[PDB]
Every structure is written in structure tokens, then in C-alpha cells.
Amino acid sequence: AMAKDSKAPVVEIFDERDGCTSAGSTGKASDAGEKGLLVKVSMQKVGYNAIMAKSVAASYMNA
Amino acid sequence: AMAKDSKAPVVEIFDERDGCTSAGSTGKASDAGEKGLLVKVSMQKVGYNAIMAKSVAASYMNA
Amino acid sequence: LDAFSKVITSADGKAAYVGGADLQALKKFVSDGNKRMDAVNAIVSNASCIVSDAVSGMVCENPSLIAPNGGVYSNRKMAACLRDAEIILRYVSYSLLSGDSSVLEDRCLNGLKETYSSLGVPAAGNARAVAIMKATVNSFINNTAQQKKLSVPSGDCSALASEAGGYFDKVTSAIA
Amino acid sequence: LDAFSKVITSADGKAAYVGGADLQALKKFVSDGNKRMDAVNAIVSNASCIVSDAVSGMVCENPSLIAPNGGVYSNRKMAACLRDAEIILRYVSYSLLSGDSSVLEDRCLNGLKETYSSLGVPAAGNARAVAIMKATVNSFINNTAQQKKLSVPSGDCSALASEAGGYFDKVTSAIA
Ligand SMILES: */C=C\C1=C(C)C(=O)N/C1=C\c1[nH]c(/C=C2\N=C(C[C@H]3NC(=O)C(C(*)=C)=C3C)C(C)=C2CCC(=O)O)c(CCC(=O)O)c1C
Ligand SMILES: */C=C\C1=C(C)C(=O)N/C1=C\c1[nH]c(/C=C2\N=C(C[C@H]3NC(=O)C(C(*)=C)=C3C)C(C)=C2CCC(=O)O)c(CCC(=O)O)c1C
Numbered sequence: 364a365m366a367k368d369s370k371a372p373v374v375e376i377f378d379e380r381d382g383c384t385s386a387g388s389t390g391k392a393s394d395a396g397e398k399g400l401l402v403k404v405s406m407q408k409v410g411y412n413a414i415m416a417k418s419v420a421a422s423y424m425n426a
Numbered sequence: 427a428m429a430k431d432s433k434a435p436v437v438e439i440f441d442e443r444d445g446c447t448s449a450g451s452t453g454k455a456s457d458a459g460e461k462g463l464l465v466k467v468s469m470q471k472v473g474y475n476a477i478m479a480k481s482v483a484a485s486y487m488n489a
Numbered sequence: 490l491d492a493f494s495k496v497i498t499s500a501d502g503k504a505a506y507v508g509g510a511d512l513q514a515l516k517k518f519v520s521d522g523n524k525r526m527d528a529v530n531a532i533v534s535n536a537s538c539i540v541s542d543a544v545s546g547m548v549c550e551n552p553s554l555i556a557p558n559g560g561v562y563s564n565r566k567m568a569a570c571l572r573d574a575e576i577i578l579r580y581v582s583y584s585l586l587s588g589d590s591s592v593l594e595d596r597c598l599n600g601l602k603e604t605y606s607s608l609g610v611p612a613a614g615n616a617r618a619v620a621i622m623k624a625t626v627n628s629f630i631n632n633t634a635q636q637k638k639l640s641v642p643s644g645d646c647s648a649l650a651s652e653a654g655g656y657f658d659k660v661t662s663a664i665a
Numbered sequence: 666l667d668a669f670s671k672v673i674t675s676a677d678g679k680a681a682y683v684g685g686a687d688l689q690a691l692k693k694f695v696s697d698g699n700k701r702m703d704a705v706n707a708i709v710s711n712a713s714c715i716v717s718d719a720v721s722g723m724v725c726e727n728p729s730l731i732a733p734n735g736g737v738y739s740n741r742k743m744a745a746c747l748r749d750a751e752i753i754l755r756y757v758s759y760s761l762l763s764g765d766s767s768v769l770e771d772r773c774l775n776g777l778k779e780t781y782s783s784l785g786v787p788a789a790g791n792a793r794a795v796a797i798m799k800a801t802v803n804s805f806i807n808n809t810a811q812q813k814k815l816s817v818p819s820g821d822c823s824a825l826a827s828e829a830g831g832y833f834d835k836v837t838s839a840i841a
């Protein structure tokens with residue numbers, strides 16, 4: 364049956380072939396033959412967004 | 427002198443007078459005489475945004 | 490795809506990091522390996538734009554949804570809808586990453602119609618939000634949106650775009 | 666303002682929470698107390714829109730800045746600039762919250778011209794981005810932006826808007 368925990372797979376694509384790197388750029392996995400490239404997937408709770416909720420309410424009529 | 431740590435004061439305004447609350451809605455401070463209202467300030471490091479950076483590069487010519 | 494199934498079954502926030510030989514096998518095991526990565530990026534890197542625009546279009550085409558007793562009346566209900574929209578979007582985006590909809594159907598769609606029906610979440614507004622997201626994701630995969638662009642090598646991604654519309658269609662079928 | 670001073674000097678991520686009598690006193694000692702909260706919200710709730718649009722405007726008005734070796738050529742420099750825009754933007758927003766520019770000048774502006782000069786950050790482009798943010802923040806405080814709106818009791822916020830432009834003027838003067 365469907366889950367009820369508001370969790371969804373959060374996919375993050377990383378293309379760092381231009382050379383700019385940070386602490387998260389290494390050690391997470393091997394890069395053999397795919398330098399600067401990575402797919403990250405995790406299950407995370409999608410929270411409520413008061414700011415966006417209020418913004419749509421006030422702004423939905425402007426395309 | 428200015429710091430060099432890329433940290434800036436992050437102000438968050440909270441207006442929850444419509445009643446909708448979450449775990450952070452209580453215990454952070456007293457609310458006496460200002461129900462649903464709070465100003466949060468902290469010093470956070472402003473990180474790099476690869477996605478926005480790439481987005482600006484590809485999209486700056488579209489207002 | 491055992492690495493993804495691991496972190497999706499556990500649902501504890503644990504990340505799977507796919508690079509190197511793993512990533513190379515992945516792009517060979519799905520179709521259009523490299524383009525598929527750019528298509529997935531088209532979606533997730535615009536997640537907030539996609540969600541905000543669809544729910545806004547749903548409401549602007551039917552402002553009753555935000556009238557008292559409406560489907561998105563009050564920040565609480567509007568916030569829950571934006572959350573559902575992103576949940577649906579990210580399950581669609583994982584389907585395009587993995588090349589099948591099994592997680593989308595099982596973990597997101599199985600019993601979603603009854604869930605919405607018992608709560609009275611209007612099916613017409615829901616289908617419309619899905620439709621706007623679908624249209625939006627179609628322009629981004631093709632890099633044909635009017636404002637925000639994506640820089641990728643030139644070529645055709647129409648097959649991946651169709652696969653993406655199919656996953657949106659399964660959402661649409663599922664919520665009737 | 667001892668609570669703010671503490672967390673700003675410590676700069677360790679410890680948040681200060683102002684509610685109730687503390688918040689009542691805070692709004693009491695600055696001008697237009699409640700409207701000031703709405704003006705600060707107008708800024709920070711749009712921090713990415715303001716920053717994205719200004720740096721985008723700086724480049725589109727002078728694309729030499731994104732030509733090879735330009736000030737924002739390559740993602741690292743473009744990211745550094747967007748971050749600077751948000752840094753400056755948020756120091757402006759703390760000034761409008763607190764009613765003075767001392768933290769902005771002391772912790773953000775003091776010596777920023779010499780830093781930019783030694784790094785080759787073009788002063789004209791910087792002033793232009795600051796200029797666009799100033800205009801953009803001005804529309805949001807007045808709730809006159811074209812697309813994103815804020816719902817607040819009707820009234821006049823020109824004084825807070827002018828005070829906000831004043832803090833931006835201090836940035837411009839410091840960046841020469
Ligand atoms: C984050 C938003 C977008 C940026 C940035 C961008 O460049 N494109 C964006 C969005 C986008 N929207 C659509 C299609 C639709 N959006 C709709 C909502 C909009 N229309 C309205 O009438 C109102 C209320 C006044 C709105 C908020 C609607 C209804 C659609 C049409 C959907 C459909 O075809 O059924 C697209 C796809 C079309 C395009 O490429 O422009 C994008 C990319
Ligand atoms: C996140 C953006 C905005 C939303 C959403 C919204 O409703 N308003 C938004 C932004 C906004 N921008 C401005 C003013 C300017 N923006 C500029 C950049 C833009 N113009 C260009 O030519 C290019 C490059 C092609 C751009 C990316 C510029 C140049 C300005 C004018 C600044 C000035 O006066 O010198 C405002 C304020 C004006 C308004 O109310 O529309 C807002 C609110």
C-alpha cells in the first residue's frame with residue numbers, strides 16, 4: 364500500500380567536470396571512469412512551506 | 427574589519443496567527459501578548475549554489 | 490538497481506552515492522544513459538518552480554479551491570497541497586532516473602485515490618496540477634521553457650520526454 | 666538588542682528567538698514596529714528571487730562579465746557573486762530589522778572595497794547588482810512587484826522603504 368510518511372526519493376545530479384569542488388565532492392563514492400559525475404538518491408520527508416504557501420495564496424493570479 | 431567567513435545574519439519572520447503550528451511553533455520563546463509572532467536571527471554561512479549559478483549562466487538573457 | 494532499492498526501502502534518510510563504475514553501469518543499464526541524467530536534472534533542479542507554478546495554475550483556473558471550505562483554503566491546506574505536488578514530482582523524477590514506475594506505483598499511488606476520496610481532496614484540481622507539472626516538465630526536459638534554461642550538448646530527448654509524460658499519466662490514472 | 670548581539674558576535678549558528686514581551690519591546694524601540702516586521706519579511710522571503718534577478722540583470726546589461734576570464738565567467742565565480750549578493754542582502758535585512766546599519770558597516774562593509782580591488786571584482790558590476798536589489802527590495806516592501814505578492818494590512822511603508830534604500834546606499838558607497 365502507499366506510505367503515509369510524506370517521504371519521497373530526493374535525486375541530486377552532480378556534474379563538477381569544470382573543476383570546482385567542495386567537501387562533499389570526494390569520499391562519497393569512487394569516480395573511476397566518470398570524473399566529476401554522481402547520482403545521489405535518498406528518501407526524505409517533504410515538509411510544509413509556509414512562505415511558498417502564503418506566496419501562492421497571494422500571487423496565484425499572476426502567470 | 428569585515429569578517430572573511432561568508433557568514434551573514436539570517437532573519438526569519440514567523441506569523442502563525444492562523445493557527446497552523448508545527449514542532450518549532452512552541453518552546454522557542456514565550457509568546458505572552460504576541461500570539462503566533464516571532465523573530466528568529468542566527469549567523470549562518472552562505473554557501474555556493476551550483477544549480478542557481480548554472481541557471482544564471484544559461485538564463486540571464488531572459489527577464 | 491539494488492543500491493536505490495536499499496535506501497528507498499529503509500526510508501531513513503540514508504543516501505546512496507552512484508559514481509564511477511557504478512554510475513557507468515547505471516547509464517548502460519537504463520536507456521539514453523547520459524541524456525537521462527540531464528532529463529532528471531531538468532526536473533529536480535526546477536522542483537520548486539514546477540510545484541509552485543502548477544498549484545498556482547490550478548488555483549487561478551479555479552479560485553473556489555482557495556475560498557472558505559475550498560481544497561486549498563488557508564495556509565495549512567495550501568501547504569499540504571504544495572507538499573503533495575512535490576512528493577508526486579519527486580516520485581516521477583525517480584521513475585525517470587530508474588527507468589520504471591514500480592516505486593511510484595507502489596509507494597506513492599497504491600491507494601492514493603481512496604486516500605484523497607475519504608478526505609474530499611478534489612480530483613479535478615488534483616488532475617489539473619498534475620497536468621501543469623507534466624506540461625512544465627516537458628518543456629524543461631526539452632530545454633524549451635521561456636525563462637529558465639539548461640546547458641547540455643545538443644540533441645534529441647523526445648523519447649525520455651515521452652517516458653516522463655507516461656509517469657505523469659500513471660499519476661493521472663491513479664487519482665482518476 | 667543584547668540577544669541579537671550575542672548570536673551575531675558568537676556566529677556559531679546559535680539562534681536568538683524573540684517573542685512575547687521581548688518581541689513587544691523590540692518593536693516598541695524601533696519605528697513603525699509591526700510594519701517593519703512586514704518589510705523585513707518582504708526581503709528575506711524573496712532572498713533567492715532578489716539575488717538571482719539582480720546578478721542576472723548585471724550580466725544581461727553587461728555580458729562582458731560572463732565572457733571568458735570575466736568577473737562571473739565559470740560557475741565558481743558566478744556562485745561566489747550570487748553568494749556575495751545574498752550576504753550583502755541579508756546584512757541589509759538585519760539593518761532594517763534592528764533600525765541601524767552598524768553591523769552592516771562593521772561586519773560586512775569595512776574593508777570590502779580593498780578586498781574586491783585586490784581580487785579584481787569589477788566595481789561597476791557590483792554597484793549595478795546592488796542597484797537592482799535596491800529597486801527589487803523597494804517593490805516588495807511596497808508590495809508592488811509584478812508577480813510575487815505579500816498580503817498585509819493596507820497602508821504606507823514608504824518610510825521603511827526609504828530606510829531600506831539607505832542601507833543599500835551604504836553598500837554602494839562602500840563598494841564605490
Ligand atoms: C517556475 C515556473 C517557470 C519558469 C521559470 C519557466 O521558464 N517556465 C515555468 C513554468 C512553465 N509553466 C508552463 C505551463 C503552464 N503553467 C500554467 C500556470 C500558469 N497559467 C495560468 O493561467 C496561471 C494562473 C494565472 C498560472 C500560474 C499553466 C495553466 C500551464 C499550461 C499547462 C498545460 O499545457 O496544460 C510551462 C510549459 C509551457 C512552456 O514551456 O512555457 C512551463 C515551462
Ligand atoms: C525573482 C524576480 C521577481 C519576481 C518573481 C517578481 O514579482 N518581481 C521580481 C523582480 C523584480 N525585478 C525588479 C527590477 C529589475 N530587475 C532587473 C533585472 C532583469 N532586467 C533585465 O534587463 C535583465 C537582463 C535581461 C534582468 C534579469 C532590472 C534591470 C531591474 C530594474 C532595476 C532598476 O530600476 O534600476 C523589480 C523592481 C521593479 C518592479 O517592481 O517590477 C522587481 C520586483
Ligand SMILES: *[C@@H](C)[C@H]1/C(=C/c2[nH]c(/C=C3N=C(/C=C4\NC(=O)C(CC)=C4C)C(C)=C\3CCC(=O)O)c(CCC(=O)O)c2C)NC(=O)[C@@H]1C
Pocket residue numbers: 410411412413414416440442446447448449450451452453454455456457461462463464466564565568682683684685
Ligand atoms: C502548519 C503545519 C503551518 C506551518 C508551521 C511550521 N512552523 C515552522 C517553524 C517555526 N515556527 C516558529 C514559531 C514560533 N515558535 C515559538 O516558540 C513561538 C512562540 C513564541 C512561535 C510563534 C518557529 C520559531 C519556527 C522555527 C523552528 C526552528 O527555528 O527550529 C515549521 C518548520 C518545522 C518546525 O516544526 O520547526 C512549520 C512546518 N508551516 C506551514 O506551511 C503551515 C502553514
Ligand SMILES: *[C@@H](C)[C@H]1/C(=C/c2[nH]c(/C=C3N=C(/C=C4\NC(=O)C(CC)=C4C)C(C)=C\3CCC(=O)O)c(CCC(=O)O)c2C)NC(=O)[C@@H]1C
Pocket residue numbers: 377379382383384385386387388389390391392393394398399400401403473474475476477479504506507508509740741744
Ligand atoms: C565548487 C565550489 C562548485 C560547487 C561544489 C559543491 N559541491 C557540493 C556537493 C556535492 N558534490 C558531490 C559530488 C561528488 N562527490 C563525489 O564523491 C564525487 C565523485 C564520485 C562527486 C562528483 C556530492 C556527492 C555532493 C553532496 C555531498 C553530500 O551529499 O553530502 C557542494 C555542497 C557542499 C558540500 O561540499 O557538500 C558544493 C558547494 N558548488 C558551486 O556552486 C561551485 C560551482
Ligand SMILES: *[C@@H](C)[C@H]1/C(=C/c2[nH]c(/C=C3N=C(/C=C4\NC(=O)C(CC)=C4C)C(C)=C\3CCC(=O)O)c(CCC(=O)O)c2C)NC(=O)[C@@H]1C
Pocket residue numbers: 376377378397400401402512516521522523524525526527528530531630631632641642643644645646649
Ligand atoms: C534532453 C534531456 C536534452 C539533452 C541532453 C543530452 N545530453 C548529452 C550528453 C551527455 N550528458 C551527460 C550528462 C551527465 N552524465 C552523467 O553521468 C551526469 C551526472 C549524473 C550528467 C549530468 C554526459 C556525460 C554526456 C556525454 C557528453 C559529455 O561527456 O559531456 C547529449 C548528447 C547525446 C548523447 O547521448 O551523448 C544530449 C542530446 N540535449 C538537448 O538538446 C535536450 C534539451
Ligand SMILES: *[C@@H](C)[C@H]1/C(=C/c2[nH]c(/C=C3N=C(/C=C4\NC(=O)C(CC)=C4C)C(C)=C\3CCC(=O)O)c(CCC(=O)O)c2C)NC(=O)[C@@H]1C
Pocket residue numbers: 439440441460463464465688692697698699700701702703704707806807808817818819820821822825
Ligand atoms: C509595508 C511593509 C506594507 C504594509 C505593512 C503593514 N503592516 C501592518 C500591521 C501589522 N503587521 C504585523 C506583523 C507582524 N508583527 C510581528 O511582530 C510579526 C512577527 C515578527 C509580524 C509578521 C502586525 C502584528 C500588525 C498589526 C495589525 C495586526 O494585528 O495584524 C500595517 C497596519 C498599520 C500598522 O502600523 O499596524 C501595515 C500598513 N502594508 C502595506 O500595504 C505595505 C505593502
Ligand SMILES: *[C@H](C)[C@H]1/C(=C/c2[nH]c(/C=C3N=C(/C=C4\NC(=O)C(CC)=C4C)C(C)=C\3CCC(=O)O)c(CCC(=O)O)c2C)NC(=O)[C@@H]1C
Pocket residue numbers: 365366367368369370371544554559560561565566567569570571573574576577596597601604608610611613614615616618
Ligand atoms: C494539491 C495539488 C491538492 C491537495 C492536496 C492535499 N493533500 C492533503 C492530504 C494528504 N496528502 C497525502 C498524500 C501523500 N502522503 C504520503 O505519504 C504520500 C506518499 C509518500 C502521498 C502521496 C496524504 C496521505 C494526506 C493525508 C494525510 C496528511 O495530511 O498528511 C491535504 C490536506 C487535506 C485536509 O483537508 O486535511 C491537501 C489540501 N489539495 C487540493 O485541493 C489539491 C488538488
Ligand SMILES: *[C@H](C)[C@H]1/C(=C/c2[nH]c(/C=C3N=C(/C=C4\NC(=O)C(CC)=C4C)C(C)=C\3CCC(=O)O)c(CCC(=O)O)c2C)NC(=O)[C@@H]1C
Pocket residue numbers: 428429430431432433720730735736737741742743745746747749750752753772773777780784786787788790791794
Ligand atoms: C557579484 C555581484 C560580484 C562578484 C563577487 C565575487 N566575490 C568573490 C570573492 C569574495 N567575496 C568576499 C565577500 C565577503 N566575504 C565575507 O565573509 C563577507 C561578509 C562578512 C563578504 C562581503 C570575499 C571575502 C571574497 C574572497 C574570498 C572568497 O572567495 O570567499 C568572488 C571570487 C573572486 C575570484 O575571482 O576569486 C566573486 C566572483 N564578482 C563579480 O564579478 C560581481 C561584481
